[PDB]
Amino acid sequence: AVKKFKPYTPSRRFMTVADFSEITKTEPEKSLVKPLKKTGGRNNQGRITVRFRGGGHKRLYRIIDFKRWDKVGIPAKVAAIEYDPNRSARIALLHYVDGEKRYIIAPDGLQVGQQVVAGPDAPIQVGNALPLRFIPVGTVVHAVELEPKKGAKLARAAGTSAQIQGREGDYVILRLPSGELRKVHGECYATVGAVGNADHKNIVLGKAGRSRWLGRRPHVRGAAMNPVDHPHGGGEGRAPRGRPPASPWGWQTKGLKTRKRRKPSSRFIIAR
Amino acid sequence: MKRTWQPNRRKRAKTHGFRARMRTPGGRKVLKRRRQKGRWRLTPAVRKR
RNA sequence: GCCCGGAUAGCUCAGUCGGUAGAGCAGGGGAUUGAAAAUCCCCGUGUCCUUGGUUCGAUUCCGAGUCCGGGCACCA
RNA sequence: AAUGCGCAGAUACCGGGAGGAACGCCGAUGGCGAAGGCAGCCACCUGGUCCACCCGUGACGCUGAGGCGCGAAAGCGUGGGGAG
RNA sequence: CACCUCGAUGUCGGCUCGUCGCAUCCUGGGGCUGAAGAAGGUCCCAAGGGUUGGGCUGUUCGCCCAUUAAAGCGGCACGCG
RNA sequence: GCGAAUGCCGGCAUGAGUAACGAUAAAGAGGGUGAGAAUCCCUCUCGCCGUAAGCCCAAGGGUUCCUACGCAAUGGUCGUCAGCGUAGGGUUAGGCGGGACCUAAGGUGAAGCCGAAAGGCGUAGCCGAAGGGCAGCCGGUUAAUAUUCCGGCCCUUCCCGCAGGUGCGAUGGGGGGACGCUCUAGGCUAGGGGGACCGGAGCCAUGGACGAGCCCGGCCAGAAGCGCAGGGUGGGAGGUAGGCAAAUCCGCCUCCCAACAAGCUCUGCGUGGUGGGGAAGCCCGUACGGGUGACAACCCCCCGAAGCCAGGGAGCCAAGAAAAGCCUCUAAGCACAACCUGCGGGAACCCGUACCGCAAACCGACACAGGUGGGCGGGUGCAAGAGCACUCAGGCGCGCGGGAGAACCCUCGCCAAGGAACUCUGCAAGUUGGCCCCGUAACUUCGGGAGAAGGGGUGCUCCCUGGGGUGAUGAGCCCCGGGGAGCCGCAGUGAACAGGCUCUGGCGACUGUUUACCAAAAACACAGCUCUCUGCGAACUCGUAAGAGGAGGUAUAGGGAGCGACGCUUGCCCGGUGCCGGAAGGUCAAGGGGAGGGGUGCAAGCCCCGAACCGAAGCCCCGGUGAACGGCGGCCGUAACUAUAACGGUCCUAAGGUAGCGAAAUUCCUUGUCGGGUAAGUUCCGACCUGCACGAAAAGCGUAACGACCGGAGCGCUGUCUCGGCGAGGGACCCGGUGAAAUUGAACUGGCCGUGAAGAUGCGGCCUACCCGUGGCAGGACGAAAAGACCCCGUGGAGCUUUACUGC
């Protein structure tokens, strides 16, 4: 769903907050498997390298398991589904028979008391992770490794998911959240299911304040500065771009593709 | 009015300190000159505890 | 006020190193129709804005003008 | 006829893959539904309806302002989807 | 036109304070008249003193409202920071 | 060899005994001292702070503390005084705060990576604090220090030792430490208010009172043991394939008891052996404390924290430090070691510790009406309150005074009649203003608009009455009320704090942000919509690089861009520019290639140019694309009254402005033309539209609610005005004290008409005019101030743009 508020205050009128019904008897995270302290800072060593970042609530990083493969065969119980401010998705805390505890980016449908596990052995069912080469072509699947033993990196941002299209030897054709059709290695792990909290995309912040709580600082429009600052700057009473829409730096920001062509990564992709 | 000089002994020794000057080839040349010039004090005199 | 451009058949326009100037429509005579249109078939027509000049000869090249359209009229 | 598509190689043919939508033949003036409607196949959930036996209740019936629900198509919202 | 002033002569309008000119709006005289009378028109003397308050606009001006004997024009660095 | 450079340095003048003398909280007198005191001391009157103008802490400052001598100078006057000179004293911890602890950002940095050098990064570690950790409170003394010295009571560490317990044992595993916002429960405490109760020196004044009168005070700390609040916490036994060794520890499973507890614990609060404080007043008394008041009393009620038990509880989303100490686990090691628990005796370093500290001792050149973080901050009354009035404790009257009683200025008070006629504008000032009760419209996104508007009550006295919390179910004490009679003034939130209100437009949705030092806004931002780039060693940004941010993120996500709540919408043109897609073509650089030619050698040779042709990206070319840069017509003629023109013609293009708006934040002509408000309206509102030159995400048109935004009405009220008057205080003025400034060729510096480089005190003629000041006014000295900020000129300079040029 998603809670809505009555206009008892402007901006309270359009604000909607996600609903944490599937948030299990948790709330505070388990200091152990996470949380690590999380270094906040909107720039590199010295200068800011990404504008409009800063402020925004204190956060505790939740060190999550992006390669469930360590525990091949070892099953584990979905002990809880906690809130995790470092991501849009919700995370599932799971106790292994091993006695080991770790967090997996909670998949959709995943539920308390449920038992999950990873490996070739694993039964194709929401939660289980295995190499792509075993996941029945066609099934949907999230958290996917791009290259073997390199850690899951595709689909995991709430309501995200990729789908097996078929295979070409060691590779399987996947359709990532982008609509891109790329070949990915078969040994690359992927946990079956579809992230979850697919409603995330429907939260309406409601007021500038909310962007601030998210560490998102006011963003200034280019044409609205002076030429010393931006390609769109100055002129007088408002003004259209007056040149191909650009970025503070000069590159056209409407159409101009940035992907470098000669990258080896291609030859593994097929349109987006 | 809140002015430009807000004294802070830590901030001084830290900013114009001796160990401060000594760390940067830039600060090392300051001491170098002040010495040649005869300056009685090579660093901003400041005391704490 | 200063500068540029346009002034060709009744209307709307095309065209020409200079020399017997065209288009569409309109208009005129026929034909088809019971009769109007549409549609066939035949037709003129233009002192090529005015005025000076150059030339053998200019609507076609040059100067002045008349009316029309466009631009400028700022620091004061 | 022209647009338009085609030697930077279309059309036509073969093989492979994607996707969406509608479901040939059976389908008939046929059937079900209160109406709108409902058509490839399968499973589950579920309404309605006919018949036989004539066993039980015993008239508990009919209709029905208002209310309530349903209600083709187009159209609107949020998101998705998109071949024709 | 550009002669003083660009090592500075503050540059509209309003307010305040005025003062002067007359080519007089009023009031005072006077000749005419297509001046019966009262009203005027017109021109000649004549500023001594008067020369209203509002609506609109920054306005000067101007147009209106309501009056008035009249509701003058102009100069004083478009008098006066 | 100097008169000039708004010359430089120094000196001394002018303005001038002039403006000032730094908050309008205020003074007066009597005694002292003294060469000399308005200005120092003391006393007594008076006024002023008191959520302070009073206290304590941190920073900063550094002797400014105290004391004795002192006054040149410094203290805007005076000074016998000083925060000033000379000198002398004074700041004393195991427990307070730093350090012989810990980690945060961030620094630094073994490995290691990178840079022409300097040097730049950087897993550990180290450094790093007002965060975590960590043992003391109450009194007493000094002129000046005190949680540091002293007294009482109470603690912490380490080393050695005796006794008794135990597998002891890490920088390693685990646990813990450990954590948000808002709202809050139960007990306490700090703090405060009563007392018919207890302990007090005294007092009865001026008409009354010797009264269960007035005035003063009725506390503090405190180990154990106890109580009373709470906070923490399951206990067993089995398995174990996880916590990068091991584990008897955690973590997982399994079963056995317990289970909104108890027990064990740990805080806090009381009580506590006991220790200590102990007014008013009165007497000494310089001062400025001491005595006495006492063998002081030290008790009962009530209000009660934003503090404590505290890691308590609930709810919420934005989902809220690390590390050590501390427990527990075991590895090496060692188990005559070693820990632990008792109890003794020893040992216990360094630095700060004075003083000012919202300020005369800090930041502002000044003893500057400014700035400066934390805690305490009493009482009464007003609904509350850290507000407002007065006032405790405490501290002040601000370091020039005395008189006057003008103009004019400042801040202030009142005003006849009228009332916005004032003005750009009701600018300013008024009106209104608290709480309780009636009662409130359009429109609306249903919240709102609401404190709409508009009214009524509000003081005090007496009677009756309803509830609560604390005592126990009564008493007193407090906390909310209801009703019934009556009194007094002009007036009852009787003073102080405490909205003027409507109707209607523009812009922006809204709370927010901005030009520190002339703009707070219609600007920026903002939720939200769209476009576009980005598959992750992402794109993009910083860096020469390494590295890093993005992100320990991964398309429901990141970057860029534009619009800008929300509603209804967002037309048509890709012909030029841009971006996207085109394995063909044309062109195209090194390069490959050598047809061919040349220079020299006697020659082999050696060196040279060099046509085909094969040679990328880019461009040309073909396509696409508008919430990509952008663009979106002209002239004629037509309807049977006229007029217009649904319709037509024909040029023009890439296509020819759709909806919706429209004399508009856009309209020139224009106070356009009709309506409306007005006695009158260049403004304003409604209209109509030849829209000089609106128009759909540089969004279009709307829109509830917001606006210290901007415009137009009206009501209320008024000195804004007609139209001024009076009055107050601070100045102005006079007297005593101290005493500037910009300016200044030098002066013995009148008016008019003239003249003059064309506006003369300084020339001509004429007219005026005894010498010198004081308070005022501002016409002139083209008055002061800034080598004009406009203009133009410098083949002057900078910032910005682009399809200027050349480059990186």
Place this chain on the structure above:
RNA sequence: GAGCUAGCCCUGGCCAGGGUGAAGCUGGGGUGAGACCCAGUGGAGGCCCGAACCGGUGGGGGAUGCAAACCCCUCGGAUGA
């Protein structure tokens, strides 16, 4: 040179007292079951009034100032960007 000013990062502190009364609950009503509608409890909010604190709207004063941006009255925000 960021001991002024701008932004961020780490760790702490502060915000009198009033008002409005969201969701949730709980009870009642409603229905086949519901939505929903009443009470009450509840305590939300870039919510409201208003100190501190943070501002700096309008006017006046100041203009060799108390001050190289101050003072007075008046306004803005005040659990939040």
Place this chain on the structure above:
RNA sequence: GGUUCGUGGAGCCAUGGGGGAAUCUGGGCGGACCACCGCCUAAGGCUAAGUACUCCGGGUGACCGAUAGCGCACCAGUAC
């Protein structure tokens, strides 16, 4: 890049990139190049003196003489 040498006919000496020998009948140079004729020996290193400067000590001066001379003749790079 250096040389006077700014492509210039541009050599010589340096060197970042690619290719890549030889040992004396080897190899570099005499300003493209070739041929004669000549000079010289690369791809390792060291080496007094003549030369530069003056913080410091001294001598001198048609050098200054306290606004001059060093910024300081004076407890000056201090006060500020």
